[PDB]
Chains A and B, each alone.
Chain A
Amino acid sequence: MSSFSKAPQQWATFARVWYLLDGKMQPPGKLAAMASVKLQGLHKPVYHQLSDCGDHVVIMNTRHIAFSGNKWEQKVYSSHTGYPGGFRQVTAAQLHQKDPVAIVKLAIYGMLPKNLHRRTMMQRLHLFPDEDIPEDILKNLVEELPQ
């Protein structure tokens, strides 16, 4: 083919590939790392920062996640409002008993770089406490990497 005068290689953009990640005892935040790698598209040799070539990751069985140590009761999630004394402390236990899909999502929410692309790639992430996937009627690729 042809190449001219010192240029980086990117053509236009491509289509993202949807991936599936299993639950059941994989460490929280340890999965969020590689899920953020797949979210950014760092696993693809064609990766570009501005192009946002990141894929769409779907994880299942988020309630079956297992955190080691005593961190179950000892982890405190802080939620503060505009009102004075609106500081709220929610333990990982109670949060798991209420809204588990939030936990892992938060573990991902700190991994990604800031500003736009964070929320942009955040919309590419979906979590469910139990397995129901109408999106599985649509054939997708499954990747298995347990810890």
Chain B
Amino acid sequence: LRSRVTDRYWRVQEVLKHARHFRGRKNRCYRLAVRAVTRAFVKCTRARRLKKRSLRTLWINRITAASQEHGLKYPAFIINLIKCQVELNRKVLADLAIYEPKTFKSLAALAKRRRXXXXXXXX
């Protein structure tokens, strides 16, 4: 004949060890701890998936701001960068949009230059 021994108590101890910092019975009771842990992991996956989206949106906002400071909008800047064969990511572009206004000013100048040259070649 077997016994329950320390197995269940150790599993509960582990779950509750992962249940620390939780609020109320969820950091005390085992069942609510598990129920909260599942949700915690699902939210971990989902938020780690949407983190890139949030960061991307934030970067787009920053670059949009820095662009609007120079008189042009975000999409025009993007198009100009595409036709300038610039594969630079929006993260580094935002970092330059913050710390190094000179580089972004140069890119904006080249952007307006390409836009004016295209508008003059089309006419």
Contacts and interface: CB of A to CB of B under 8 A. Distances in A.
The reply, when asked whether chain A contacts chain B directly with Cβ atoms under 8 A, is: yes
Interface of A: 8-9, 42-49
Main secondary structure of the interface of B (DSSP, over half): helix
B62 A45 contact: yes
Nearest to A46: B98
Interface string B53-70: 001001001111110110
Given A45-B66, A45-B94, A46-B98, 11 more contacts: A8-B58, A9-B95, A9-B98, A42-B64, A43-B68, A44-B65, A45-B63, A46-B62, A47-B58, A48-B58, A49-B58
Nearest to A43: B65
Contacts of B97: 45
B62 to A, nearest CB: 5
Main secondary structure of the interface of A (DSSP, over half): loop
Contacts, number: 27
A47 B63 CA distance: 10
A49 B57 CA distance: 11
Contacts of A44: 65
7 contacts: A8-B58, A9-B98, A43-B68, A45-B62, A45-B94, A46-B62, A46-B98
A42 B64 CA distance: 9
Interface of B: 55, 58, 61-66, 68-69, 94-95, 97-98
Given A45-B94, A45-B97, A8 B65 contact: no
Nearest to B55: A8
Contacts of B55: 8
Given A9-B95, A9-B98, A45 B65 contact: yes
Task: Name the residue in B61, B63, B97, B98 with the highest tally of chain A Cβ atoms < 10 Å from its Cβ.
Answer: B61
Question: 7 closest pairs, A vs B, by CB?
Answer: A45-B66, A45-B97, A45-B62, A45-B98, A45-B65, A43-B65, A44-B65
Contact of A42 (B65, B94, B98): B65
Task: Name the residue in B58, B62, B66, B94 with the highest tally of chain A Cβ atoms < 10 Å from its Cβ.
Answer: B62
A9 B62 CA distance: 12
Contacts of B69: 43, 45
Contacts of B58: 8, 47-49
B91 to A, nearest CB: 9
A49 B55 CA distance: 11
Contacts of A9: 95, 98
